[PDB]
RNA sequence: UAAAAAA
């Protein structure tokens, strides 16, 4: 009667009804209506039509044309161009005149959006930058010359780092290691043969992560869709978490966890901390409460002084037969942590906020089949079911292929672009907050809508890919250091996985 | 390492 996984509430109800087909049969689904989508000074609210004139195909999935982004900076960015030559060769002669061009390109086009950069600084050429060479080990020379600039960049300066080969995770590992994690300074990286081609739909991508870093705000959920997402009684917005766990970043080398968090009512930014695991294949984050204390730091900031009243702890990169574990361990952990860290913080009063937690499964074998291209929907309108040759986003599927006793529930956010979609599978494994099927199922598709680098639903809710991303990030700063740390070898945690500079935990830099 | 999607 304390952290046992979940049982089944109910099933959901809300949606058009229509049957699928799936590997095990006809299946009834219910399709949810997207939230509204908000830009700066406009919204985009898909409303069913029939199927016909591709009008689905719009479902959670936008673009930035005639929009512009909620918050930018308000003072003009420098954007300092590092072209990262990682060939043996001399960049063409063209190189220096075509990357001003593109800089200046860049610069108009995402003015547009709101985000105002000067593009003055003349681009910076770093030739024989790689990983430190062949124990012992010499920097490379770029590297000493990067380090150089980097201690002298001015202030107000994003760096583009403009990758002359793609592919390179070497060289990309290295770089972040470098910037994020040793000087923690703002940075994208950009693959020259993209960037070049001067195309306002690829710049525009490419500030969307700019402006998080930035701590801006791209697109967002409207306020009425936000308040699924704020606790009525204290009118607080719930902290939303997502974790993953990611292992052998090197062979044999303990795991990496990460754990984001929201921190106040547009849940547009989720910075977040990462740690090694104790051991290698682990698939549980024993001390995952100990990642709490930023998670409610940083959201009290950003609330007055108030810690949230309500939990939200979505668990990706899990197996069924963990779920036990999920529980009786990370739960009991978030929630013994936040005992501990609440009156640190709160001038000393009892903090024990309700918990729900859900876990993903991204990568399943079920597959959805539409059998209609219309259906009646809730206003009895003969209404689009499917796009692009794949169930509707967010086809939900509760009943059928599901389990009756525990609270699981597969939705299929996505526009599948390309192939066949895969649904993702949640499970409720916890939830001390009254949740219903319907409540979480629209809350798991609307958090699908807010993944602020892309203008598309995602498959899986924005805070277990921001999760995923973390580790993966994290992944670089272990390989970076890895070749080092074995040759003066176990090893601390700290040393295998250093922590990132201050200046960059509270920011979105693995975006 | 533009981005989602798919593998």
Redesign the pocket.
């Given at each position: 009667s304390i952290y046992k996984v979940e049982n089944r509430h109910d099933y959901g109800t809300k949606g058009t009804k229509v049957d699928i087909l799936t590997g095990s049969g006809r299946v009834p689904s219910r399709i949810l209506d997207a939230p509204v989508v908000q830009f700066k000074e406009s919204t985009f609210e898909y409303k069913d039509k029939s199927y016909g004139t591709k009008h689905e195909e719009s479902k959670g999935?936008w673009n930035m044309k005639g929009h512009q982004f909620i918050s930018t900076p308000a003072k003009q960015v420098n954007l300092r161009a590092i072209f990262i030559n990682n060939a043996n060769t001399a960049p063409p002669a063209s190189m220096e005149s075509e990357l001003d061009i593109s800089m200046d390109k860049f610069a108009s086009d995402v003015k547009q959006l709101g985000v105002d950069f000067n593009v003055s600084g003349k681009p910076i050429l770093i030739n024989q930058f790689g990983p430190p060479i062949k124990p012992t080990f010499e920097t490379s020379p770029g590297e000493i010359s990067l380090l150089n600039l980097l201690e002298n960049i001015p202030s107000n300066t994003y760096i583009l780092?403009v990758?002359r080969?793609?592919?390179?995770?070497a060289?990309?590992?290295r770089l972040?290691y470098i910037t994020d994690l040793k000087f923690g300074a703002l940075?994208?990286?950009?693959?020259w043969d993209?960037?070049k081609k001067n195309?306002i739909?690829?710049n525009?991508?490419?500030v969307?992560?700019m402006n998080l870093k930035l701590l801006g705000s791209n697109h967002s959920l409207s306020i009425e869709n936000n308040k699924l997402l704020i606790d009525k009684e204290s009118n607080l917005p719930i902290l939303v978490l997502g974790s993953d766990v990611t292992h052998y970043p090197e062979k044999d080398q303990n795991s990496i966890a990460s754990l984001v968090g929201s921190y106040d009512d547009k849940f547009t930014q989720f910075p977040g901390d990462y740690m090694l695991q104790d051991g290698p294949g682990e698939e549980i984050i024993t001390n995952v409460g100990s990642l709490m204390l930023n998670r409610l730091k940083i959201y009290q900031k950003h609330n007055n002084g108030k810690l949230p009243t309500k939990i939200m702890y979505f668990r990706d990169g899990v197996s069924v037969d963990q779920f036990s574990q999920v529980v009786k361990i990370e739960v009991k952990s978030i929630k013994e942590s936040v005992r501990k860290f609440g009156p640190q913080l709160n001038g000393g009063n009892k903090y024990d906020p309700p918990v729900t937690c859900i876990a993903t499964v991204?990568?399943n074998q079920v597959?959805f089949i539409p059998i209609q291209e219309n259906a009646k929907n809730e206003k009895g309108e003969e209404v689009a079911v499917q796009s692009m040759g794949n169930v509707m986003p967010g086809t939900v599927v509760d009943r059928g292929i599901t389990s009756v006793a525990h609270f699981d529930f597969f939705i299929?956010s996505?526009?599948?672009?390309?192939?066949?979609?895969?649904?993702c599978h949640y499970w409720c494994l916890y939830d001390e907050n009254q949740s219903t099927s319907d409540y979480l199922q629209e809350i798991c598709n609307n958090l699908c809508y807010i993944?602020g680098?892309?203008?598309?639903?995602?498959?899986?809710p924005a805070p277990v890919?921001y999760a995923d991303?973390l580790c993966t990030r994290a992944t670089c700063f272990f390989k970076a250091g890895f070749e080092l740390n074995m040759a003066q070898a176990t090893v601390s945690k700290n040393v295998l996985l250093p922590q990132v500079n201050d200046n960059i935990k509270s920011v979105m830099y693995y975006?």
């Open positions: 999935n780092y990758l080969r793609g592919n390179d995770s060289v990309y590992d972040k940075n994208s990286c950009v693959v993209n960037f195309s739909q690829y525009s991508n490419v969307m992560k991204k990568r597959r299929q996505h526009q599948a672009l390309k192939g066949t979609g895969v649904p993944f680098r892309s203008t598309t639903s995602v498959k899986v890919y991303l975006i």
